[PDB]
């Protein structure tokens, strides 16, 4: 009967707020630093959202004086011996509020300069619904954003800084609740504890933002390959194997519970990519996921001229701005060595090109991984000295990344005109 107490005593503080707030805010921290690669050193910075809300909202029109900006740009990226950051990860959930909109506007103001794509997640309060599962009911989010409720948001999608924000939808289950027959608490070598239950039913037992696995794939897409082509699709990047599902015996026979918050359909995968969101879609029953779309919050536009239309399609694509960013981490990092050496217009075009040259091809290699070694297709690098300043220059590169698959239509038909020898008149 002492078990009856413990099953009440401990279950009183595990269900308690504040206590399970740290759980959420550490389980999803453990999730990131689970892989441990050869050359991918993560790093923490525990800060309340409000302590940054006040920061950017006070220094939106003076970002260089922002305290955070002075702990990522001018601190490690700018300074000599400093080690620059790469792809920040916002563990927060951002709504459609006109306050949280600034939070992104500021963090992106940093990311844009520090060159570090800021990945985050968006709350279910965005689509104006109290249960994220009920987003499936919305037909097309494309027609949704036309609603005047998103006016402030559509303005932000037009900003340049938004080409570095990458917001994710859906939240993966990060902990299985405690049952004796399922996920038993590892008791002690004598203190019988394994017989210990929890208390949940519908949908309210710990979640974590998809942004984790998104970044935790960018890490993967670096130890294996070297660039960030390997974070999309099933066969290529985002697959995310083996997630923490859940099972429960209400009355039937252990009816499984999908690991993901929401079971996105096919046209949901797409109808979100246009809004500038990253859906974390699940394979029904398979207890797995995959990132089909990896788009920034930047507007895609349309345009009449075909070239212009294609430009905006690649810029919105996050996976490229991750790569183009890695060139900035090459320039402002390596060329710093020869800051005093005597060099020319024809010499800087050598050093900068001789490097990137090993990462540009046209031929395709078997398998995705063996080819994702080569992110770019071709590059131009036209540097040129400026008048007045003798020792100063001004470069201007332009990279065309290997355009990813994105979909296709198809019209099948019985022609009966292909082989006229069987249906023709002459016989």
């Amino acid at each position: 009967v002492i078990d009856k107490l413990i099953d009440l005593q401990v279950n009183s503080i595990i269900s308690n707020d504040e206590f399970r707030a740290l759980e959420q805010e550490w389980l999803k921290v453990q999730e990131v630093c689970q892989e441990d690669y050869d050359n991918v050193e993560v790093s923490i910075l525990d800060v309340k959202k409000e302590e940054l809300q006040y920061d950017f909202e006070r220094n939106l029109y003076d970002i260089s004086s922002s305290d955070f900006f002075k702990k990522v740009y001018v601190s490690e990226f700018d300074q000599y011996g400093g080690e620059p950051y790469g792809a920040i990860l916002g563990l927060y959930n951002f709504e459609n509020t006109t306050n949280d909109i600034i939070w992104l506007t500021g963090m992106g103001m940093v990311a844009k300069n520090s060159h570090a794509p800021f990945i985050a997640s968006i709350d279910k309060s965005f689509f104006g619904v109290k249960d994220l599962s009920e987003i499936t009911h919305i037909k097309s989010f494309e027609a949704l954003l036309e609603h005047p409720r998103y006016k402030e948001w559509n303005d932000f999608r037009n900003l340049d800084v938004a080409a570095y924000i990458g917001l994710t939808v859906g939240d993966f289950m990060l902990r299985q609740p405690y049952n004796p027959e399922n996920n038993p608490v590892q008791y002690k070598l004598m203190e019988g504890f394994n017989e210990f239950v929890d208390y949940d039913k519908n949908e309210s037992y710990l979640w974590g933002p998809a942004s984790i696995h998104l970044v935790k794939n960018m890490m993967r897409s670096y130890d294996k390959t070297r660039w960030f082509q390997y974070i999309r699709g099933v066969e290529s990047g985002g697959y995310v194997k083996n997630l923490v599902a859940c099972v429960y015996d209400n009355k039937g026979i252990l009816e499984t519970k999908s690991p993901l918050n929401v079971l996105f359909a096919d046209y949901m995968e797409l109808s979100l990519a246009n809004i500038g969101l990253i859906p974390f879609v699940s394979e029904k029953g398979t207890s797995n996921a995959c990132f089909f779309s990896v788009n920034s919050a930047k507007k895609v536009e349309e345009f009449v001229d075909g070239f212009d239309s294609a430009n905006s399609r690649l810029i919105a694509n996050l996976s490229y701005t991750m790569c183009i960013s890695r060139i900035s981490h090459y320039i402002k990092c390596v060329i710093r060595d020869k800051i005093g050496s005597i060099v020319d217009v024809e010499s800087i075009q050598k050093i900068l090109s001789d490097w990137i040259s090993e990462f540009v091809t046209t031929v395709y290699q078997p398998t995705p991984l063996e080819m994702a070694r080569y992110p770019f297709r071709n590059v131009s690098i036209e540097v040129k000295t400026i008048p007045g300043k003798p020792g100063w220059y001004s470069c201007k590169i332009n990279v065309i990344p290997h355009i990813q698959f994105e979909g296709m239509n198809t019209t099948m038909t019985i022609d009966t005109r292909l082989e006229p020898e069987l249906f023709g008149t002459n016989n």
Partner: peptide, 12 residues
């Protein structure tokens, strides 16, 4: 903020 869901949810 009255916890009439933590107290009502007694369970033995």
């Amino acid at each position: 903020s009255f916890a009439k869901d933590i107290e009502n949810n007694r369970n033995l």
